[PDB]
Design an enzyme around this catalytic site. Structure first.
Site, mmCIF file in Angstrom:
data_model
loop_
_atom_site.group_PDB
_atom_site.id
_atom_site.type_symbol
_atom_site.label_atom_id
_atom_site.label_comp_id
_atom_site.label_asym_id
_atom_site.label_seq_id
_atom_site.Cartn_x
_atom_site.Cartn_y
_atom_site.Cartn_z
ATOM 1 N N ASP A 199 0.084 -12.717 4.046
ATOM 2 C CA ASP A 199 -0.473 -11.821 5.067
ATOM 3 C C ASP A 199 -1.152 -12.634 6.177
ATOM 4 O O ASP A 199 -2.247 -12.310 6.651
ATOM 5 C CB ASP A 199 -1.393 -10.799 4.400
ATOM 6 C CG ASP A 199 -1.717 -9.614 5.286
ATOM 7 O OD1 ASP A 199 -0.923 -9.310 6.213
ATOM 8 O OD2 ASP A 199 -2.746 -8.944 5.006
ATOM 9 N N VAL A 242 -15.592 -3.549 4.041
ATOM 10 C CA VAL A 242 -16.216 -4.842 4.206
ATOM 11 C C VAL A 242 -17.560 -4.637 4.890
ATOM 12 O O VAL A 242 -17.665 -3.883 5.855
ATOM 13 C CB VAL A 242 -15.302 -5.808 5.020
ATOM 14 C CG1 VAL A 242 -15.986 -7.138 5.295
ATOM 15 C CG2 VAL A 242 -14.011 -6.027 4.262
ATOM 16 N N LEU A 261 -18.686 -3.517 8.389
ATOM 17 C CA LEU A 261 -17.907 -4.251 9.394
ATOM 18 C C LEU A 261 -16.480 -3.728 9.577
ATOM 19 O O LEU A 261 -15.915 -3.794 10.682
ATOM 20 C CB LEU A 261 -17.835 -5.730 9.027
ATOM 21 C CG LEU A 261 -19.165 -6.470 8.978
ATOM 22 C CD1 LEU A 261 -18.916 -7.894 8.474
ATOM 23 C CD2 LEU A 261 -19.862 -6.486 10.334
ATOM 24 N N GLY A 262 -15.902 -3.200 8.503
ATOM 25 C CA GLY A 262 -14.502 -2.790 8.525
ATOM 26 C C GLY A 262 -14.060 -2.036 7.275
ATOM 27 O O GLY A 262 -14.715 -2.088 6.236
ATOM 28 N N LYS A 289 -17.116 -7.367 0.075
ATOM 29 C CA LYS A 289 -15.876 -6.640 0.187
ATOM 30 C C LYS A 289 -15.737 -5.788 -1.067
ATOM 31 O O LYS A 289 -15.512 -6.297 -2.177
ATOM 32 C CB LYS A 289 -14.722 -7.623 0.289
ATOM 33 C CG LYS A 289 -13.358 -7.016 0.446
ATOM 34 C CD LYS A 289 -12.350 -8.212 0.492
ATOM 35 C CE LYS A 289 -10.946 -7.790 0.467
ATOM 36 N NZ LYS A 289 -10.061 -8.975 0.608
ATOM 37 N N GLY A 297 -10.179 -1.094 5.317
ATOM 38 C CA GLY A 297 -8.724 -1.116 5.250
ATOM 39 C C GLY A 297 -8.257 -0.199 4.142
ATOM 40 O O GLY A 297 -9.057 0.545 3.572
ATOM 41 N N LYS A 298 -6.964 -0.271 3.823
ATOM 42 C CA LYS A 298 -6.393 0.507 2.724
ATOM 43 C C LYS A 298 -6.936 0.064 1.363
ATOM 44 O O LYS A 298 -6.948 0.845 0.411
ATOM 45 C CB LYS A 298 -4.863 0.383 2.706
ATOM 46 C CG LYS A 298 -4.182 1.483 1.884
ATOM 47 C CD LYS A 298 -2.696 1.214 1.624
ATOM 48 C CE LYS A 298 -2.064 2.347 0.807
ATOM 49 N NZ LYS A 298 -2.258 3.696 1.429
HETATM 50 C C1 LIG Z 1 -14.218 -7.078 10.158
HETATM 51 C C2 LIG Z 1 -14.320 -8.178 9.059
HETATM 52 C C3 LIG Z 1 -15.314 -9.139 9.156
HETATM 53 C C4 LIG Z 1 -15.409 -10.145 8.182
HETATM 54 O O1 LIG Z 1 -16.388 -11.066 8.325
HETATM 55 C C5 LIG Z 1 -14.533 -10.194 7.080
HETATM 56 C C6 LIG Z 1 -13.525 -9.216 6.981
HETATM 57 C C7 LIG Z 1 -13.437 -8.217 7.976
HETATM 58 C C8 LIG Z 1 -12.621 -9.222 5.898
HETATM 59 O O2 LIG Z 1 -11.724 -8.362 5.809
HETATM 60 C C9 LIG Z 1 -12.721 -10.214 4.909
HETATM 61 C C10 LIG Z 1 -11.831 -10.233 3.823
HETATM 62 C C11 LIG Z 1 -11.931 -11.242 2.870
HETATM 63 O O3 LIG Z 1 -11.072 -11.284 1.836
HETATM 64 C C12 LIG Z 1 -12.927 -12.205 2.966
HETATM 65 C C13 LIG Z 1 -13.801 -12.173 4.035
HETATM 66 O O4 LIG Z 1 -14.786 -13.078 4.148
HETATM 67 C C14 LIG Z 1 -13.711 -11.191 5.015
HETATM 68 C C15 LIG Z 1 -14.618 -11.197 6.089
HETATM 69 O O5 LIG Z 1 -15.477 -12.087 6.138
#
Ligand SMILES: Cc1cc(O)c2c(c1)C(=O)c1cc(O)cc(O)c1C2=O
Ligand SMILES: [Cl-]
Ligand SMILES: [Cl-]
EC number: 2.7.11.1
Length: 328
Positions: free
Chosen positions: A154, A51, A43-44, A66, A46-47
């Site tokens: 954040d 995810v 899904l994503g 994650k 980051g640094k």
């Molecule tokens: C693109 C994207 C979709 C997501 O559903 C999450 C995240 C990013 C996400 O970064 C994330 C971080 C987190 O600490 C808990 C989450 O449930 C999440 C997420 O659920």
């Protein structure tokens, strides 16, 4: 040197707790079974993590995984402990499990499923009513974590996951969150540029939960004025200049003088002299349906230079802006 500062609420919550609550460095992680989870889709990234949508094959339920990038063992236990401390709280993302990823050789946090739609995708198209509704839901999460001795640090649209169909919201990504200890000096390199409070931008380290309330204010301003972001700095210095062009330079100098802070001399050639603007200047035919006297008063009380003068989360929930929102 700088004058000290203390939170005006939940000041001493951690000082009365047992060590185990806030001493995240001592936390013994309890590992589940990585075999329970099948990764479906990235899904994503980051640094600090990647995810994934995943499925828990032991109960067939969707989850989000994650996988933490190597960063600092300290930061890993900190996020874990914070997530465990806050679990079950209003609108806080729920940590379901912690497993070791076999490929990355790092911890993977498993969260109960949320729709893959962040607030940034929705928040520019909400009705007045829905802006109020979802702001109140975000406040529930913030007052909860603040009451538990934790600041998020954040708060931003990407960190609010929304399921608009079900009128449901979760505050995510606690990887920058920290425990509030009175008199402690914190890293100012937190939050995303557009959401950084003045305290960060002037390098004042003795900040508190009120940082999150500035960030919330930035979100509110962006929604009601349909201006993304509201304070649009090109770097961290220009970020403060953009703030000063709205709130004025006299109140900025009053703030830094109160705490005996000196600006980076780099500001001498860029800050200038600016009057406080009336909020009506940001109102126009395309956003006016989102603006009310109550909205502007509320915003005015969030976006203060002096972190001590901002509404707390609970005071914010008392505001007349939320009178029209149906309470459960
Ligand atoms: C693109 C994207 C979709 C997501 O559903 C999450 C995240 C990013 C996400 O970064 C994330 C971080 C987190 O600490 C808990 C989450 O449930 C999440 C997420 O659920
Ligand atoms: Cl940090
Ligand atoms: Cl608060």
């Amino acid at each position: 040197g700088p004058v000290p500062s203390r939170a005006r609420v939940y000041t001493d919550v951690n000082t009365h707790r047992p060590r185990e609550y806030w001493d995240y460095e001592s936390h013994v992680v309890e590992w589940g079974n990585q075999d329970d989870y099948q990764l479906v889709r990235k899904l994503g990234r980051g640094k600090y993590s990647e995810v994934f949508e995943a499925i828990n094959i032991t109960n067939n339920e969707k989850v989000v995984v994650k996988i933490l990038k190597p960063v600092k063992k300290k930061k890993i236990k900190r996020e874990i402990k914070i997530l465990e401390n806050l679990r079950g709280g209003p609108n806080i993302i729920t940590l379901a499990d912690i497993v070791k990823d076999p490929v990355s050789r790092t911890p993977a946090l498993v969260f109960e499923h949320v729709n893959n739609t962040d607030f940034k995708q929705l928040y520019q198209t909400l009705t007045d009513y829905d802006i109020r509704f979802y702001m109140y839901e975000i406040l529930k999460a913030l007052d909860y974590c603040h009451s538990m001795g934790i600041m998020h640090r954040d708060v931003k649209p990407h960190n609010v996951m929304i399921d608009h169909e079900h009128r449901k919201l979760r505050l995510i990504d606690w990887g920058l969150a920290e425990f509030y200890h009175p008199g402690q000096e914190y890293n100012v390199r937190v939050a995303s540029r557009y959401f950084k409070g003045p305290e960060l931008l002037v390098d004042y380290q003795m900040y508190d939960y009120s940082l999150d309330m500035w960030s919330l204010g930035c979100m509110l301003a962006s929604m009601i004025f349909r201006k993304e972001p509201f304070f649009h700095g090109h770097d961290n210095y220009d970020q403060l200049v953009r703030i000063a062009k709205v709130l004025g330079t006299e109140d900025l100098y009053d703030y830094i003088d109160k705490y005996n802070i000196e600006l980076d001399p780099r500001f001498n050639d860029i800050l200038g002299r600016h009057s406080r603007k009336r909020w009506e200047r940001f109102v126009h035919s395309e956003n006016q349906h989102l603006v009310s006297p109550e909205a502007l008063d509320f915003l005015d009380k969030l976006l203060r230079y002096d972190h001590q003068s901002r509404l707390t989360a609970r005071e914010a929930m008392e505001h007349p802006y939320f009178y029209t929102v149906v309470k459960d």
